[PDB]
Write a protein that binds this ligand. Structure first.
Ligand code: DST
Ligand code: DST
Ligand code: DST
Ligand code: DST
Lengths: 210, 208
């Protein structure tokens, strides 16, 4: 079954366009994620990676960081019984409070579910590689691809990547060990995404086996 | 000014469509690369990175490997005085014959040119990172972003990436230290690229 990575982009522009607070933008994002997970389950996806943040996002003022961390965490608070939950990334950039709570939510999630919802926090290839080197430096005889795969943020290969929000770039979010990922860029702001947008993405992605 | 990375794709399909040998497709690519460098030079790009091959490509049958290595090398024999030439990548996968000649051709090129043509060979993120780790393991106190950048295949940050040939994916070619590279995907087979295709690509890229 399919491994899909979702890059939810456009919450701020959506908030401004609809004349609402950024908090309401992130709440609309959380509701969309829950909706999007349901679509993914119907569509043969077994693992949904969501890029919760780039490493740079965690350098914003703490209140702004707490704002998006709280929105992503609330999704798991509401739906952790509907899937197996895990997270990974630049954990050195995340506060103790959120790491502690997300670890609790992982333990409480349905370990028997066929569907995985996995958050990647603080994505950045340079940060990822730097961290991996400094953890293993002088501790092993040689690096191999198997060892690199074991230490990478994204622990499996990604088949498809969907980026909302109109940017045609990968920013900090390219998955290190996933050379073959097919990319689909949508101009739609993430909180406006419909199932029709998702279905169009999957038809595009599926037709690449011409 | 700007740093552009080109992914030339579609030589096989172009060869079949035009009923010629794969060597002839690669010859057409070489001519197109020279033409494309002229467009790039006129449009103010100062560094043009070209992905000559993925790591996987060097696993192809060995005559096929010599075919693309020869076609890319021929470009640099022909134009190395018109730019500064350099190359990098998974050189452990490249034949020492081409590595010797390319190393000579690098030393040969116009060191004073304000335009750089740089080949990346055997590109692969995992292979790149494994190699960097194994090169520095136990020899430095700690890795930093600056040390990683000094060891990465692509030695500078990439502003724009153009991938021809219709694939909407980065395959083995994502540049490690260039998170903010803007991507442009063209459906045109590389040897079919026209100046209009290049101008449309840059217009899209410049507006972004
Ligand atoms: C979490 C995601 C998918 C995007 C947030 S990072 P961003 O909006 O800053 O991305 P860009 O820097 O704009 O490319
Ligand atoms: C989930 C995070 C942290 C950012 C995603 S949305 P954004 O802040 O980039 O919003 P805009 O792209 O600026 O509209
Ligand atoms: C040199 C370039 C840009 C592509 C050659 S590798 P390829 O044709 O096998 O491309 P894919 O890896 O299959 O996407
Ligand atoms: C430059 C190299 C080595 C491969 C790029 S062209 P290709 O062999 O992928 O040709 P096709 O895409 O298969 O038509």
């Amino acid at each position: 079954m399919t491994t899909l990575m979702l890059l939810p982009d456009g919450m701020r522009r959506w908030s401004e366009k609809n004349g609402v607070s950024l908090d309401d933008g992130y709440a609309a994002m959380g509701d969309k994620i829950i909706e999007f997970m349901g679509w993914a389950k119907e569509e043969g996806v077994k693992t949904l990676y969501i890029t919760a943040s780039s490493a740079a996002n965690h350098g914003r003022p703490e209140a702004a960081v707490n704002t998006f961390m709280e929105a992503f965490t609330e999704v798991i608070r509401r739906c952790h019984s509907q899937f197996k939950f895990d997270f990974s990334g630049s954990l050195d950039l995340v506060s103790e409070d959120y790491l502690t709570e997300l670890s609790a939510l992982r333990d409480k999630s349905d370990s028997e579910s066929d569907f995985t919802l996995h958050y990647i926090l603080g994505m950045s290839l340079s940060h990822e590689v730097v961290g991996i080197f400094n953890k293993l430096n002088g501790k092993i005889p040689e690096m191999t691809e198997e060892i690199l795969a074991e230490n990478a943020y994204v622990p499996t290969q990604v088949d498809y990547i969907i980026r909302t929000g109109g940017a045609i770039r990968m920013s900090s979010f390219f998955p290190l060990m996933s050379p073959y990922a097919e990319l689909h860029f949508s101009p739609v702001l993430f909180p406006d995404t419909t199932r029709a947008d998702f279905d169009a993405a999957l038809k595009d992605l599926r037709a690449r086996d011409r």
